[PDB]
Paper text:
Cobamides (Cbas) are coenzymes used by cells across all domains of life, but de novo synthesis is only found in some bacteria and archaea. Base activation is catalyzed by a phosphoribosyltransferase (PRTase). To gain insights into the mechanism of base activation by the PRTase from Methanocaldococcus jannaschii (MjCobT), we solved crystal structures of the enzyme in complex with substrate and products. The protein fold consists of an eight-stranded mostly parallel β-sheet with connecting α-helices on both sides where the substrate binding pocket is built from the connecting loops and resides at the end of the C-terminal end of β-strands.
None of the structures described here contain a free base, although they were present in all crystallization experiments. This is true for the apo structure, which contains no ligands in the active site. Superposition of these two structures shows that significant changes occur in the loops extending from Ile 37 to Ile 45, Ser 293 to Lys 314, and Pro 333 to Tyr 348, such that the active site of the apo structure is open to solvent in contrast to that of the complex with either NaMN or α-RP and nicotinic acid. The rms difference between these two structures is 0.94 Å for 329 equivalent residues, indicating the significant conformational changes that occur when substrates bind. Strikingly, residues Lys 173 to Asn 181 that were disordered in the apo structure became ordered upon ligand binding and contribute to the distal component of the binding pocket for the nitrogenous base. Altogether, the movement of the surface loops serves to close the active site on substrate binding.
Residue numbers in the entry:
A (entry chain A), B (entry chain A): 1 to 171, 182 to 349
Write the structure that this text describes.
Amino acid sequence: MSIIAINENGFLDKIKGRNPLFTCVISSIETTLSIPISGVHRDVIKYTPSADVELVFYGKSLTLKTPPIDATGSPTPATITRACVELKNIKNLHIDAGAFVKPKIPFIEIDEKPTGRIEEGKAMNNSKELYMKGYLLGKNLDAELLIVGESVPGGTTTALGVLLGLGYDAEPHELKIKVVREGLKKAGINEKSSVFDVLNAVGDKMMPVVAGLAISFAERNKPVILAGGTQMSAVLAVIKEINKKVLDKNLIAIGTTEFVLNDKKGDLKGIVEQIGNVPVLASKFYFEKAKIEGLKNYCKGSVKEGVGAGGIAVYSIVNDLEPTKIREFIENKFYEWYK
Amino acid sequence: MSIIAINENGFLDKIKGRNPLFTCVISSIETTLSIPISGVHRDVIKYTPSADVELVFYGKSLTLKTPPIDATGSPTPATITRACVELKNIKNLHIDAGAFVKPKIPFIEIDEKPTGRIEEGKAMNNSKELYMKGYLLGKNLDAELLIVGESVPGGTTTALGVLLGLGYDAEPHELKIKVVREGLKKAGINEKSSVFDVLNAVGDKMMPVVAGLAISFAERNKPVILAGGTQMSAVLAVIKEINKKVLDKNLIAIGTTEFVLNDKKGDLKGIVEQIGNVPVLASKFYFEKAKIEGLKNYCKGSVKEGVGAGGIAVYSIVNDLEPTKIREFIENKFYEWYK
């Protein structure tokens, strides 16, 4: 009941009681090394996606030694995901699709090379192969429910490129749009372009992998929560163009945070509307009824989501986790760190 | 009933009907590049472990383009494993623990660096960390039953080193024993040595990973089939010294081929006897009632086992697979290849 639900279509009943697998797909983008399309600082951006999944899987990052909660009590999104993993004993297994630095936990290697130069239109040359790798991997994972998140610094830009390239209406932000517009041009994207032509131009390698995993579960009549926001709407668009029919089973949902579902300029629901009547679910954290400033002002400043935090919280709450156990886990971890 | 069973202890009843996960742990050993302790030829030995798991997971190897069945009809062990995977729809996911060349299928990366120089006593420096990585990975895999095989060229030597080092009585073969005897000496293995001191001296990186995975399943009261022969007996010895108590649950078995269970000089049952009353199971292939020579003479020449072929066949037959469907799968694949 701490869950928002747009076009629910029964989906919450399907995920109740199901044993889940949580997986985060990570990648890096060459563009982000010289064009500030990501908020992640240049001196940590190479380490950041692997540090996220290390924290979720092991409980702390192993190369980045920066605290996961800052001095004001503001948690990184991976900290929220880790809270749900610990509180609800969520099995988790993470996939690399080209992060600059590889995790030091066990991880599934799907592609060692990073996503390329978006502005040159040279994101990928293998999106179709990445999709089939994601599909065959998905066939070999055994769970009642797939929760799949992402951690790609700069993935809001590639998700804009893909939503535009497939024809959708999706509109700092001025620089994001120059990068993709130039990329779609320099790779000659027309309207007879395939979804793989568009991914190869301006996508990120996470998107075809996640699409592959989602379709393989939805084909076997198993629910999928795409745990993210804008980046996940681009994956949904990819799915529709690959296997439109399985979208209609109403087994693929989008899980995000309340902070994303009401973003002034974001309009996640505007995007999903153009794609289809897909369930969209947000989790309520009640961070404002909290002691520390960073947690209390969490809804302000940056739109806060990542590493499947929103979507795994949706699953956790729907399965009887008191929502404020998340807040108190973070608070207890804050005071253990001392900063 | 095409299953041999020594000290069955009820184990076959536990695995009937269980949904399995099959996983192969691969590694390479620096020793094998300059000392002929492996039968695998020097010009394919770097490619061979990854080619095995590619074949099991995808249905063909992707860098080694040599046929998986030779011109006389003799199948590689990975071909038998792939037969069971296809016929019984076995979910499979493979782990790298230092193979020279990495698989081109998705795979779990646990350690990129190969096992070191056995004869120098420098196999590993991280066996305890590899074990915990295997244990934490195992906690995050969801199946009713674990079938875990191996593919390590030269692993018969490291398994001799470990069985000797832990004090067991385990005795071409003359050169294997010089390599390990020198390794145990040059690393000063005494009788106050830990199991991790011995693995760090003359083990292979597959052994602590597999031990970690086995114990994590057996602790949650789930059966494990250690799918191999002599190499797997060394893993059982490692397990006993790490967590002797979970051995007694009678949830960890050894699955191998009939060709291994009756090897003149091997004596698998002699080894397992010194370790404990562990179930040992062999699968019957009836390759002698076959047309092609290589399949008909399969019991002759080389002791034939690898890539969990024996153990996954045990699981498959016990769950109602007609044993000669394996033979006919290989025969049909032989004639498709034409060689």
